[PDB]
């Protein structure tokens, strides 16, 4: 096998020929490329450039694939070291799967003429003037509707329906009610645009967030329809009407990286409640055990230290009541002390993905 | 292209006569500087200094100026290289700026001798005697000022004038009152010196202290003249009294460094604010959900659990009532739980903010 | 699990005066809108005062200014002091505590009628 010497800047770099023709669509391997370097003089390949660098450019050559940036060598350096050598774009790929950067960018735009303009008035909101202008009217539209739903609650308002019962109506009276009317139509107007004018209708139910604006529609339609068409499903349908807050999460970008990072901390989680309930059973059960004797004491159960235990583990507050035995008084020193022990330990995992996630927008 | 051998301590490095003419007034480009080292009997250059170190200092030749650090090298022995090779004062300055050093020490002493003298006397402190008796008067009067602010407001002082309303005085019978304008006589001729002493008075309202010192000037001016000269100013221009707290931020190298990582941190304090809002609104509207039927709670109304769902979230305390239901209460420890996971995730970016400004002063 | 007992009727003549109570348990009044109903022979229920929580106290026509309803506020009792009681209230009345949306609850009777 003939052998190879190149001279990056002194350093004598050798190699066998077959190793630099594995791959021969490359600088080095292809002859003619090579031939301009080439220095008949002294039988070497002279090139001026980076010396930390040519080493791992040859390793790439010799191990069939594999290319690692050294630790000394900055990014900027190395990236451009790769296309000085034609290492292809598979390579440079490759080097970002290793320096591990996200690739994805596909926005499959229609193009059908003007599928594709609504789209891009409707989907990014840099784009025009009325993209920014149709950003701010759904955000401010989210924001009142938010208020009605906790305004509706107030005492105040309801100052003449505040009657027994035994003496949502269609008579367009109440203020709420036609202001909400308004909201829900905008809703519903710009999801159908949005579906109508989408690039991919089998995908279109898989994104999360369009899946969040049909059920911010839904209970508003079976209220009316069961109206003008119980009891048990009523007390749920006007609680999953508080997740119009969430609908609020594709004009930020801080609920979306809370989103992604609660999505990949589940084990932790998981680990945070379980760690919790073990606590709760151990210490509930050994303060009612040290303070029942005395006549005064007021844990007349184990599951009644159950509410102590979670808020003197969490350092909240108050409890039920308070121990007034001396053992009582042990038993909730330990228990105040193991909470911030075993609530702090699954924590730093959690935040530090939401780091990582919070500057990959970078 | 000639070619030329350096060899540093047996390690050769070899480049082309053009590389190194690029840059011509430095050493290793000037012919004669050069011609000291160079040794004829080898046809080499031969030096002895650090070899991690000319290695970076023949890229700075072959890259047309870039100058960065091998991270095995120590920031002593590389400043020291600069200088033997003779880079440059703009190529010391551009290691410092990847170093990221802050570089700004623009003083401008006005030099007309009497403004440059008195200038000297009240702005830097550390400059004679009477500059740093002119720092404790001032502090001091600044700290009289406060106890002034706060004992005006104490009932046992006010026993005579306590009394129905229907039945600031320039009487001068009241001491507060006369202790109060000695110490706004005291601010305001220290602020028009600094005023008429200062070498760029175009920029003088645009340095933030200069600002907090005109804003503490203000109310007791514009309630002087509306008395000898309304019911709404009063109670706002009572509580912009309160920013001679801010102005003791001349004389301390801890609030600037505070206002510093506040102002370099703002969409941090907003991620905060806004997950909090998020929480209020989805655990207050839960616990209300879960405990209205019970005849003897007390939550009556999403806008009435707002202050519970606060004070809980953030592990303070009482909050206006506590759950009596078995449903309130596990919507009241996940409540607890969820409160430090999120107001623990943005955290870590201020402290880090604060910890390199904290340490930039060294 | 709740009740709501009232004592004070019986019957009385022309110009007199009375009070009759409302206490319960398993339902603090504190937190609860409250009001007293009455019932004459041959119609349908009406209204003798209402204090809806906070202190907000309104009255039908016929009571107006001979009636008071006060909330003791303490020892889960409403109290109503009727006042020159006229033929026309002659009647059977009740009491009620109640949550608009949730739950409604009602006393047993008591009844006074006037001479």
């Known amino acids: 096998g003939e052998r190879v010497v190149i001279n990056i800047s002194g350093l004598r770099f050798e190699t066998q020929l077959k190793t630099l023709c594995q791959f021969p669509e490359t600088l080095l391997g292809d002859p003619k490329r090579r031939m301009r370097y080439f220095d008949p003089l002294r039988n070497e390949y002279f090139f001026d450039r980076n010396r930390p660098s040519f080493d791992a450019i040859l390793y790439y050559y010799q191990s069939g694939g594999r290319i690692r940036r050294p630790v000394n060598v900055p990014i900027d350096i190395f990236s451009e070291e790769i296309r000085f050598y034609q290492l292809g774009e598979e390579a440079m790929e490759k080097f970002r799967e290793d320096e591990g950067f996200l690739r994805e960018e596909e926005r499959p735009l229609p193009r059908r003429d003007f599928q594709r303009q609504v789209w891009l008035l409707f989907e990014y909101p840099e784009s025009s003037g009325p993209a920014r202008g149709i950003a701010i009217v759904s955000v401010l539209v989210i924001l009142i509707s938010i208020v009605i739903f906790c305004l509706e609650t107030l005492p105040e308002f309801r100052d003449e329906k505040d009657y027994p019962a035994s003496t949502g109506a269609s008579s367009f009276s109440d203020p709420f009610f036609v202001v909400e009317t308004l909201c829900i139509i905008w809703f519903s107007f710009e999801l159908l645009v949005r579906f109508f004018a989408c690039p991919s209708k089998a995908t279109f139910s898989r994104n999360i967030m369009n899946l969040i604006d049909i059920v911010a529609i839904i209970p508003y339609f079976i209220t009316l329809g069961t109206e003008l068409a119980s009891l048990a499903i009523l007390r749920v349908i006007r609680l999953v009407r508080v997740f119009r807050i969430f609908k609020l999460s594709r004009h930020s970008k801080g609920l979306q990286i809370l989103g992604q990072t609660l999505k990949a901390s589940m084990r932790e989680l998981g680990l945070l409640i379980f760690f919790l309930f073990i606590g709760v059973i151990l210490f509930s059960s050994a303060v009612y055990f040290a303070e029942a004797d005395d006549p005064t004491s007021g844990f007349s159960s184990i599951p009644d230290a159950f509410w102590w235990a979670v808020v003197t583990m969490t350092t909240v507050g108050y409890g039920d009541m308070h121990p007034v035995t001396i053992g009582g008084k042990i038993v909730g020193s330990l228990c105040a002390i193991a909470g911030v022990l075993t609530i702090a330990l699954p924590v730093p995992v959690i935040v530090s993905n939401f780091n990582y996630f919070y500057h990959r927008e970078t | 292209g000639e070619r030329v051998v350096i060899n540093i301590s047996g390690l050769r490095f070899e480049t082309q006569l053009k590389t190194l003419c690029q840059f011509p007034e430095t050493l290793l480009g000037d012919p004669k500087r050069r011609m000291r080292y160079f040794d004829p009997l080898r046809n080499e250059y031969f030096f002895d200094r650090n070899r991690p170190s000319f290695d970076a200092i023949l890229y700075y030749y072959q890259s047309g100026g870039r100058i960065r650090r091998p991270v095995n090298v120590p920031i002593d022995i590389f400043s020291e290289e600069i200088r033997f090779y003779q880079l440059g004062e703009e190529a010391m300055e551009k290691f410092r700026e990847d170093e990221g050093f802050l570089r700004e020490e623009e003083r401008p002493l006005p030099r007309r001798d009497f403004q440059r003298q008195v200038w000297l006397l009240f702005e830097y402190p550390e400059s004679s005697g009477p500059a740093r008796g002119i720092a404790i008067v001032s502090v001091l009067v600044i700290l009289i000022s406060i106890v002034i602010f706060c004992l005006e407001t104490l009932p046992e002082f006010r026993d005579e004038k306590d009394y129905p309303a229907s039945t600031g005085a320039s009487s001068f019978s009241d001491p507060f009152f006369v202790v109060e304008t000695l110490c706004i006589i005291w601010f305001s001729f220290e602020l028009l010196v600094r005023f008429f002493a200062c070498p760029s008075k175009a920029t003088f309202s645009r340095n933030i202290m200069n600002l907090i010192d005109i804003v503490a000037i203000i109310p007791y001016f514009i309630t002087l003249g509306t008395e000898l000269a309304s019911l709404a100013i009063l109670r706002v221009i009572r509580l912009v009294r309160v920013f001679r707290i801010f102005k003791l931020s001349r004389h301390s190298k801890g609030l600037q460094i505070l206002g510093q990582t506040l102002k370099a941190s703002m969409r941090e304090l907003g991620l905060l604010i806004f997950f909090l809002f998020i929480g209020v609104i989805l655990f207050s509207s839960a616990v209300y959900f879960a405990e209205a039927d019970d005849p003897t709670s007390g939550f009556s109304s999403i806008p009435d659990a707002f202050w519970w769902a606060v004070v809980t979230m953030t592990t303070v305390g009482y909050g206006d009532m506590h759950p009596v239901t078995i449903g309130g209460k596990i919507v009241g420890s996940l409540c607890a739980i969820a409160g430090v996971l999120t107001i623990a995730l943005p955290v870590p970016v201020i402290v880090s903010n604060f910890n390199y400004f904290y340490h930039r002063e060294t | 699990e709740v009740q709501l007992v009232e004592s004070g009727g019986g019957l009385v003549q022309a110009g007199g005066s009375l009070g009759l109570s409302c206490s319960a348990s398993?339902?603090?009044?504190?937190?609860?809108?409250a009001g007293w109903y009455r019932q004459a022979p041959g119609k349908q229920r009406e209204f003798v005062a209402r204090?809806?929580?906070?202190?907000?106290?309104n009255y039908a026509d016929t009571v107006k200014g001979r009636f008071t309803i006060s909330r003791d506020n303490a020892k889960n009792t409403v109290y109503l002091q009727m006042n020159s009681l006229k033929p026309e209230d002659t009647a059977v009345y009740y009491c009620?505590?109640?949550?608009?949306?949730?739950?409604?609850?009602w006393g047993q009777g008591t009844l006074v009628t006037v001479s």
């Open positions: 009620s505590s109640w949550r608009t949306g949730f739950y409604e609850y």
């Open positions: 398993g339902l603090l009044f504190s937190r609860n809108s």
């Open positions: 204090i809806r929580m906070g202190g907000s106290i």
